[PDB]
Amino acid sequence: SLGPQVAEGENVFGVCHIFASFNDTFVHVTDLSGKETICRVTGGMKVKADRDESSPYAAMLAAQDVAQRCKELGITALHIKLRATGGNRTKTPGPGAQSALRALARSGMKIGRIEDVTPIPSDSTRRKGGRRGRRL
């Protein structure tokens, strides 16, 4: 729980995988390989109503909790892998992406590289909904 044994003067790097969907936000810090989870706080566990799971306020609250727990383990800098739902469905990142990443930059973390890892398909299976679409 103390963290890495290393002298100062260098950063130790983790990676946060941000999943900014339209229904909630996942802030999920892991090591370089991605195999070891270090802290996963979701935007939906910081609100009392499930209408606000995707709120930018929840994303800000989630990132602050992740950053504070990240400081405990000793990680100082993060690489960003922004991600929308992607795949067959919509590919634009949700409202929580902007606020979740801004919080990590204001909570003492150091931002490394930013990349987009949304899963675009070469072509996927037929999409949910009728031929007439989701009409309302």
Added chain:
RNA sequence: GUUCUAUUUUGUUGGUUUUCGGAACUGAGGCCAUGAUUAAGAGGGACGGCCGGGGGCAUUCGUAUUGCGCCGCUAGAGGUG
């Protein structure tokens, strides 16, 4: 040339054969200014270099989706106005 063959021919009655005309076939010739309109801003075809998500058969690659196995940390995740 061959065949069939009308009738003028032999003084007046009978027999053959020509010529003579009519019909047919056939051999060797002369000659034509000897004999085929052009090649459609019609078409068919051949030929030459290309061109194309045209067609059929086989092969090869891609991420995504779903499902399963293992590993990590966690209490929520999904959807909706």
